[PDB]
Amino acid sequence: PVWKDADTTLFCASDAKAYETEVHNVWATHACVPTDPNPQEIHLENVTENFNMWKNNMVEQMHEDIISLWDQSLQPCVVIKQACPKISFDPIPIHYCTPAGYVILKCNDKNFNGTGPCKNVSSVQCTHGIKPVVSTQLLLNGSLAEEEIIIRSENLTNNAKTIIVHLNKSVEINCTRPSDIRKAYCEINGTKWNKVLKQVTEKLKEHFNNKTIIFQPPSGGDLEITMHTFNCRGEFFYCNTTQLFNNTCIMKGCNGTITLPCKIKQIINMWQGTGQAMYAPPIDGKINCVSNITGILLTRDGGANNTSNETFRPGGGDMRDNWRSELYKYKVVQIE
């Protein structure tokens, strides 16, 4: 035993083939180390420890990882004049491990909303395979809750704090652009989507005191925040998630396949801050991705403590809460 809450400089590990150039590998061979050959996680009997993912520093430290991954690897056309070669792109799991004198604690309490104490703690040396997808409004290719749906928020009462809806059922998404080049779409199972979405509203009313929950498309911003931007094979997609957030469809004559209009923007505003950048025309041929929806990035706006309704509009932008959704059950303690 003996430990104390502390921080340090972490290190990473990954199953990264040294021949492939799917950039996540090419970067995880020269910055990460091989995966733990034989790894054990030791449970701690009759012990309880408090966690909180919003003041946690593993998240920050991982953000400083993906930033260098994207500034090093993928390069733009545009005083900045470069060559913009088409590259390969496919994320891979990356484990996060403590050096010497420290260890990682893991909360496997079946539910657990993130901030607070555990009860079923365990001590690991590395995290686990965590895919660094950089996406907004919808969390894709993450992990899933092993019990029920959970809403994660710092201050649930606050009105500019982002919300996170960890799902217990992965909703398949399928986005394509075959053979204007950059005119794409995304097919989603409306049946699966709205079954799970009914569930999502039930939980939101469980936290918000049997109040009428309503989903609304974004107020107004740049397409980065108001339009589901993800990265597909080195292509930056933009999907008008307006048919996803409709409270009418919660019988009814809407439950089939929800095609969604998308576009492959060349001019994007970075998520690392400071400026914009332009890339290059799409690769000829079918460009598509098949990802799992697993989390949900909402920002209910305030001004309805009195009315019997609360409006929730999709959000995101600060990719930090993309990581929080995954390193919520981990804390780095030092062997004091």
Ligand X SMILES: *[C@@H]1O[C@H](CO)[C@@H](O)[C@H](O)[C@H]1NC(C)=O
Ligand Y SMILES: N=C(N)NCCCCC(=O)NCCN1C[C@H](NC(=O)C(=O)Nc2ccc(Cl)cc2)CCC12CCCCC2
Q: In the complex, which residues of this chain contact ligand Y (CB under 6 A)?
A: 134-136, 224, 229-231, 236, 268-269, 271, 273, 317-318
Q: Distance from first CA to last CA of the chain, Å, rounded?
A: 9
β-pair partners for 150? 166
User: Cα(45)–Cα(246) distance, rounded to whole angstroms?
Assistant: 47
User: Cα(221)–Cα(199) distance, rounded to whole angstroms?
Assistant: 28
CB of 329 to ligand X, least distance (A): 10
169 binds, among ligand Y, ligand X, none (CB under 5 to 8 A by kind): ligand X
Residue with Cβ nearer ligand Y (53 or 140): 140
201 binds, among ligand X, ligand Y, none (CB under 5 to 8 A by kind): none
Query: Rg for the chain (alpha carbons), in Å?
Result: 21
Strand, helix or coil at 311?
strand
CB of 239 to ligand Y, least distance (A): 11
CB of 197 to ligand Y, least distance (A): 23
229 binds, among ligand X, ligand Y, none (CB under 5 to 8 A by kind): ligand Y
309 binds, among ligand Y, ligand X, none (CB under 5 to 8 A by kind): none
CB 245 within 8 A of CB 256: no
Residue at shortest CB range from ligand X: 116
318 binds, among ligand Y, ligand X, none (CB under 5 to 8 A by kind): ligand Y
Using left for φ > 0, alpha for ψ between -120 and 50, and beta otherwise, residue 317 falls in left
CB of 260 to ligand Y, least distance (A): 16
Give the chain's length. Answer: 336
CB of 291 to ligand Y, least distance (A): 11
Residue with Cβ nearer ligand X (8 or 187): 187
Strand, helix or coil at 318?
coil
